[PDB]
């Protein structure tokens, strides 16, 4: 929540939906990386 | 000129036949008071044909029942149960028309079946007998239409529709004015940090869609609020919201950054300042504020407690986007302040949400159902069904279902729809005679805003854009690229030349009651080349009925009188028809006939040969004043052939003679060189015929260069003289006789007069007629600033010959960078100022000196220059360029400041003690 | 649209969110393919 701070703005119409723009949204998103599912979409959106 | 033409012989012709005439007056004031009585009667009948569509439209609503299931509706669905009826070809509509079944247009956004849509097709079938009656009550009616609040639209003639069609009738110019009042609106865009990303692109879009629901009585201004509140507009107050001023704000909206802290307290305190003032103008009507934030944790009670004591400013708030913030306080803001909160999820929902904003403001109209039914005419626009310039008349339809019995009265509010009956301007222009009155004369009409109904340069192809930038890297090989539902609102001060005299005319005409004024002006010639200066006598009256127009008749001062056709011998006119046949081309000449009107005709698409042969057939049946005039015109130009041109036969010289008369007969005599007469056979839209009537001397026109085709040495240049006739102490100017000078022959006089140095025969207009020196002999007819600008920039600066720079709003250009689009252009037009035909000067450009001497010839249109040199050091500074350069419009930030006098309307419904605002929500 | 009756006809799909680049589709219920209705259908989705 500090490194990414809800910086997921982008100005597009695609739902980059695993944002960190809350606390419990960040909790669920973080868990996704541990299970190793789909952590491209998480990461690709971090560097973008 | 006096010899090659038989002008003095043609004086001898009109003076010979003292019979076959009776010179009649125009009176002017009488023609306009008569024409004002007709345009009233035009609107009278169509006015009422709304009133039959309003009364019988309300009655069927009161007995509808509301059927839920549907197993029985048989309509047309005009975009393809369904019917497929017959079609007759017609010319009033230039399409296929039905006359027996109503059509239905449904937007391709909303249909299934639907219990909302389909239930409204049930009761709106009842209108069609009332549709069918007015056709047989009165022929020549254009598109009747019932629009509706749910997007339906029925219209009686039924034509099929005109690749992706958007067209939502709930946002169309004519539907909005008839469902609201004027609006002092104010759009506030929240621009903090919370709106970057998805919610930015929506507001950039949603503001740009909100401004299209404005008419031209509405006022706006765009104020982001932030830390501080500013106007990102370059306006600081309310605009008039033209076509133009709406374009300014969209370039302002599309460059908004997003960062900072929301406050709402400096913002609204900035907003309630703007709707005050009462200094500029404003419509003083339903005041809207609109708030485009994304949620925010503030019920800003303070500012509403300080400024909405009286509750006379309603607030629409919208929230866009898919933020997870609070939509709490914002629903509290609207519902208290008579607002109606709406919510824009994403793109696609934008069109549906920004149009229901007008239904909320209809609440004072629905509470005043006695007086609110007045016919509100929309100004002018191009119809979507391709008919031309149309003007609509509208009248709203209420949902009276609970009256004098009352009942629960739940939706005794919001209206049903707007009935519309359109009117072509051609319908008007057949009421306006423009065939007895001297081609620089014309009827003309102004709305209360200062916009135009009948100036003869309206010309379809809408107006008014900056430099029309298109990139081709952004588009796809695909979708239709929308067609601009924008009206055509032309300013009177931009339909002509601006003058201190005309503004006095415009400000009096926009409200006043009678008057006329005669003066001296600059006149822009047709297909702009040339400004003449002459006299005008023009009047004005308002329409005795409505105030939504006022006429005016411009006249040349030599045009009080006209020729009455009167032939009572019937053999003489038949001999005149015998001239008019194509059998006599070696005898008379190629005789050409302008497209005009009678009973069963057509228009020649350059097959004037066919139209003439069609016209020949007409009188052969007959064997009413235009038909007699052309016959009376026919022999009076024939006698110039047989009594003056027959006795000459192809001189040393001429190349080709021609005679243009009003009445539409133009003859070129050799007929081998006549077939090349490359101009407009319409005498009233002809360019040189009008220009010839202004001056009292010889007129020279320089043709173009490359132009499409053989206008050249092949052609030569054009001479002209208006023919003045002295009937018994009167002055009539019927005809114009032209000589087309063979160029190399006129080189041969110009050469041998030189031998018995750099000289230019030059016109008014800076266009090269001829020269020495043989580099210029191919440029003939190019503006001389493109040849020798160092002279010409000097020559104007040591005066005569000056310039005005108008702007044209309908010309079409090529787009730049970042097929055919309309764009605002400039036009330099050069003219003479000062007399004393002896202008010598000594030019030093820089480091080299040379000599000028400019001599204006007498009793003609000619500059003769003697310059001596080229061979010294050159001076390529710039190029004074005529033609049209694509450019911008005027400065909108300063045009708004000293704005433009006008008047608003007179209803402004607002604030009933009834209403009751609990819906919202 | 959210509801059975109110979701048919056509609508506007925007390729990237320029509101000019506007394309059509028919609209219909996409029953989302790993649905929880029957307990047979549920275990095939808790498996994923
Ligand atoms: C430029 O070219 C012109 C040809 O287009 C020449 O114009 C001709 O000039 C003649 C004398 O200058 C004129 O002759 C006179 O014609 C009238 C009737 O047209 C007669 O009554 C006169 O008697 C006769 N003059 C004499 C002395 O007999 C021609 O009318 C006239 N036009 C033509 C032939 O079309 C110009 O002369 C010429 N300029 C120069 C400087 O050479
Ligand atoms: C809206 O649609 C409904 C049908 O869905 C139309 O209602 C129909 O109205 C006609 C006359 O208005 C009814 O005809 C009558 O039927 C009786 C038989 O019960 C007969 O004895 C009468 O002489 C007459 O023929 C018809 O029954 C009725 N249809 C239904 C299904 O009830 C209605 O007319 C439509 N609205 C408009 C404005 O047209
Ligand atoms: C013109 O005004 C009248 C005002 O009463 C409107 O009539 C009312 O329309 C509503 C629409 O929702 C009807 O409600 C419906 O009732 C049925 C009954 O079972 C219900 O099942 C539906 O879910 C729906 O809510 C209401 O009954 C009706 N009033 C009466 C007395 O019939 C009328 O619709 C207005 N016209 C238009 C075009 O809006
Ligand atoms: C327009 O509104 C302004 C308010 O912003 C008025 O400005 C005041 O004018 C009076 C004199 O008429 C000055 O004494 C005040 O100092 C002005 N206000 C401020 C804040 O400086 C103005 O009068 C109004 N009318 C016109 C014609 O400008
Ligand atoms: C509408 O037009 C009629 C007809 O022109 C006006 O009648 C004029 O009345 C004045 C007296 O006020 C007479 O001197 C005029 O001669 C009348 N006109 C004509 C043509 O004779 C009527 O006044 C106009 N309506 C209004 C409200 O001005
Ligand atoms: C306009 O219509 C007339 C028809 O009356 C055309 O004249 C004919 O032209 C053709 C060749 O194009 C000849 O074979 C005919 O003999 C001409 N006369 C008639 C009576 O048919 C004229 O060419 C048309 N002009 C254009 C531009 O289409
Ligand atoms: C358009 O041309 C006219 C030519 O007459 C200009 O009007 C003259 O302007 C001068 C000074 O600019 C004045 O001294 C004269 O009194 C004006 N004469 C008339 C008859 O009005 C006019 O200024 C030009 N306008 C533009 C924008 O160039
Ligand atoms: C208007 O309608 C009436 C009656 O239908 C008719 O007499 C009159 O000629 C119409 N007006 C015009 C300008 O034709
Ligand atoms: C924003 O863009 C508009 C249009 O190009 C321009 O007028 C304005 O100066 C721009 N502002 C900034 C800060 O770039
Ligand atoms: C216009 O008319 C007045 C008076 O009749 C006259 O003095 C003036 O010369 C006329 N204008 C022109 C351009 O000749
Ligand atoms: C048209 O005239 C221009 C002079 O400005 C010249 O440059 C051009 O070549 C001409 N057109 C053609 C097709 O030669
Ligand atoms: C041309 O006119 C302008 C108008 O102000 C003047 O400043 C200038 O001196 C003139 N040019 C010359 C060469 O005198
Ligand atoms: C004509 O122009 C000259 C200079 O070109 C000027 O001095 C003179 O006053 C002008 N005459 C009139 C009547 O304007
Ligand atoms: C300017 O004058 C000088 C002489 O003083 C000469 O040498 C030079 O070539 C001239 N240049 C131009 C551009 O006329
Ligand atoms: Ca915020």
- Morphology call of chain A: globular
Compute the number of helices of chain A.
2
Shape of chain B: globular
Q: What oligomerization state is this entry in?
A: part of a larger assembly
Largest sheet of chain A: none
Task: State the secondary-structure class of chain B.
Answer: alpha+beta
User: In what range is the share of β-strand residues of chain A?
Assistant: under 5%
Q: Provide a count of the helices of chain B.
A: 23
- Hey, roughly how much beta strand do the residues of chain B contain? 15-25%
Bound molecules: a molecule of 3 linked components (NAG-NAG-NAG), a molecule of 3 linked components (NAG-NAG-BMA), a molecule of 2 linked components (NAG-NAG), 2-acetamido-2-deoxy-beta-D-glucopyranose, calcium ion
Number of strands of chain A: 0
Distance between the termini of chain A: 16 Å
Largest interface: B-C, 21 and 18 residues
Biggest sheet architecture of chain B: 6 strands, antiparallel
Structural write-up:
- In chain A, 42% of the residues lie in helices and 0% in strands.
- With 48 residues, chain A is mainly alpha-helical.
- Chain A is globular, with a radius of gyration of 10 Å.
- By secondary structure, chain B is α+β, with helices and mostly antiparallel strands.
- In chain B, a hairpin with a 6-residue loop joins β34 (849-856) and β35 (863-868).
- The longest helix of chain B is centred in the first third of the chain and has 34 residues, at 29-62.
- Chain B is globular.
- Classes of the chains: A mainly alpha (48), B alpha+beta (921).
- At the B-C interface, α6 of B face β1 and β2 of C.
- The structure holds a molecule of 3 linked components (NAG-NAG-NAG), a molecule of 3 linked components (NAG-NAG-BMA) (2 copies), a molecule of 2 linked components (NAG-NAG) (4 copies), 2-acetamido-2-deoxy-beta-D-glucopyranose (7 copies) and calcium ion.
- Residues 847-848, 873 of chain B line the site of one 2-acetamido-2-deoxy-beta-D-glucopyranose (NAG).
- Residues 705-706 of chain B line the site of one 2-acetamido-2-deoxy-beta-D-glucopyranose (NAG).
- It is classed as membrane protein.
- The entry lists the keywords complex, channel, membrane protein.
- Structure of the mammalian voltage-gated calcium channel Cav1.1 complex for ClassII map.
């Amino acid at each position: 929540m500090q490194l990414f701070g809800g910086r997921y703005d982008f100005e597009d119409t695609e739902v980059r939906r695993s944002n960190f723009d809350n606390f419990p949204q960040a909790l669920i998103s973080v868990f996704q990386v541990l299970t190793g599912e789909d952590w491209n979409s998480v990461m690709y959106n971090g560097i973008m | 000129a006096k010899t090659a033409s038989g002008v003095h012989q043609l004086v001898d012709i009109y003076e010979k036949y003292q019979d076959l005439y009776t010179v009649e007056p125009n009176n002017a004031r009488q023609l306009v008071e008569i024409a004002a009585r007709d345009i009233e009667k035009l609107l009278s009948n169509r006015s009422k044909a709304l009133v039959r569509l309003a009364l019988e439209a309300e009655k069927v609503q009161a007995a509808h029942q509301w059927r839920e299931d549907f197993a029985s509706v048989v309509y047309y669905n005009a975009k393809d149960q369904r019917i497929k009826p017959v079609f007759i070809d017609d010319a009033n509509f230039r399409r296929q028309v039905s006359y027996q079944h109503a059509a239905v247009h449904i937007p391709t956004d909303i249909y299934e079946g639907s219990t909302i849509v389909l239930n409204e097709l049930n009761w709106t079938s009842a209108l069609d007998d009332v549709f069918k009656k007015n056709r047989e009550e009165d022929p020549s009616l254009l598109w009747q239409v019932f629009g509706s609040a749910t997007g339906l639209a029925r219209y009686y003639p039924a034509s099929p529709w005109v690749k992706i069609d958007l067209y939502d009738v709930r946002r169309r110019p004519w539907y909005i004015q008839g469902a609201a009042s004027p609006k002092d609106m104010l759009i506030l865009v929240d621009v903090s940090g919370s709106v970057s990303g998805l919610t930015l692109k929506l507001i950039r879009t949603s503001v740009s869609e909100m401004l299209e629901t404005l008419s031209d009585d509405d006022f706006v201004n765009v104020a982001s609020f932030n830390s501080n509140a500013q106007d990102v507009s370059c306006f600081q107050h309310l605009v008039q919201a033209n076509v133009r001023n709406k374009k300014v704000l969209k370039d302002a909206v599309n460059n908004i950054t997003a960062k900072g802290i929301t406050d709402y307290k400096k913002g609204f305190s900035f907003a309630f300042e703007q709707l005050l003032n009462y200094n500029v103008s404003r419509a003083n009507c339903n005041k809207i504020i609109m708030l485009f934030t994304d949620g925010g944790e503030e019920r800003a009670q303070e500012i509403f407690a300080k400024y909405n004591k009286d509750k006379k400013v309603r607030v629409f708030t919208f929230s866009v986007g898919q933020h997870n913030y609070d939509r709490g306080p914002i629903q509290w803001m609207a519902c208290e302040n008579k607002g109606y909160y709406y919510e824009i999820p994403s793109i696609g929902a934008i069109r549906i949400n920004t149009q229901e904003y007008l239904d909320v403001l209809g609440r004072p109209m629905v509470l005043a159902g006695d007086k609110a039914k007045q016919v509100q005419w929309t100004n002018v626009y191009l119809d979507a069904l391709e008919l031309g310039l149309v003007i609509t008349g509208t009248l709203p339809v209420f949902n009276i279902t609970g009256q004098f019995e009352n009942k629960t009265n739940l939706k005794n509010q919001l209206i049903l729809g707007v009935m519309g009956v359109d009117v072509s301007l051609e319908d008007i222009k057949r009421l306006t005679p423009r065939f007895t009155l001297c081609p620089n004369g014309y009827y003309f009409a102004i709305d209360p805003n200062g916009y135009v109904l009948l100036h003869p340069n309206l010309q379809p192809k809408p107006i008014g854009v900056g430099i029309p930038t298109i990139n081709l890297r952004k588009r796809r090989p695909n979708v239709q690229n929308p067609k601009s539902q924008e009206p055509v609102t032309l300013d009177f001060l931009d339909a002509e030349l601006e003058n201190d005299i005309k503004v006095e005319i415009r400000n009096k005409m926009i409200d006043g009651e009678s008057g006329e004024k005669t003066f001296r002006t600059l006149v822009k010639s047709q297909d702009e080349r040339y400004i003449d200066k002459g006299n005008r006598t023009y009047t004005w009256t308002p329409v005795n009925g409505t105030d939504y127009s006022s006429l005016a008749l411009v006249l040349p001062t030599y045009s009080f009188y006209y020729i009455k056709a009167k032939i009572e011998e019937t053999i003489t006119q038949a001999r005149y028809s015998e001239t008019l046949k194509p059998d006599n081309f070696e005898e008379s000449g190629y005789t050409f006939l302008a497209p005009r009107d009678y009973c069963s005709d057509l228009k020649p698409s350059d097959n004037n040969t066919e139209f003439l042969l069609n016209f020949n057939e007409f009188i052969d049946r007959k064997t009413t004043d235009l038909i007699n005039r052309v016959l009376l015109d026919a022999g009076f130009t024939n006698e110039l052939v047989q009594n003056y041109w027959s006795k000459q036969k192809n001189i040393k010289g001429v190349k080709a003679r021609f005679v243009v008369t009003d009445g539409g007969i133009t003859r070129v005599y050799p007929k081998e060189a006549g077939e090349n007469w490359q101009e407009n056979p319409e005498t009233y839209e002809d360019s040189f015929y009008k220009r010839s009537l202004d001056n009292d001397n010889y007129v020279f026109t320089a043709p173009y260069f490359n132009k499409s085709g053989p206008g050249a040495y092949e052609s030569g240049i054009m001479v002209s003289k208006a023919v003045e006739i002295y009937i018994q102490g009167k002055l009539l100017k019927p005809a114009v006789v032209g000589i087309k000078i063979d160029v190399n022959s006129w080189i041969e006089n110009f050469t041998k007069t030189s031998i018995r140095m750099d000289c230019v025969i030059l016109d008014d207009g800076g266009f090269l007629l001829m020269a020495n020196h043989d580099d210029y002999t191919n440029q003939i007819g190019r503006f001389f600033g493109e040849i020798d600008p160092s002279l010409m920039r000097h020559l104007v600066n040591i005066s005569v010959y000056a310039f005005n720079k108008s702007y044209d709003y309908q010309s079409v250009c090529e787009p730049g960078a970042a097929s055919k689009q309309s764009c605002i252009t400039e036009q330099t037009q050069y003219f003479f100022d000062n007399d004393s035909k002896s202008f010598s000067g000594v030019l030093d450009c820089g480091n080299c000196s040379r000599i000028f001497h400019v001599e204006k010839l007498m009793n003609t249109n000619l500059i003769f220059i003697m310059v001596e040199s080229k061979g010294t050091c050159p001076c390529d500074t710039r190029l004074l360029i005529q033609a049209e350069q694509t450019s911008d419009g005027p400065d909108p930030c300063d045009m708004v400041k000293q704005p433009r006098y006008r008047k608003g309307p007179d209803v402004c419904f607002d604030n009933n003690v009834l209403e009751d605002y609990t819906d919202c929500x | 649209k959210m509801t059975e009756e109110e979701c048919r006809g056509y609508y506007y799909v925007y390729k990237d969110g320029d509101p000019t680049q506007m394309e059509l589709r028919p609209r219909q219920w996409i029953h989302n393919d790993f649905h929880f209705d029957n307990v047979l259908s549920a275990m095939m989705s808790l498996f994923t």
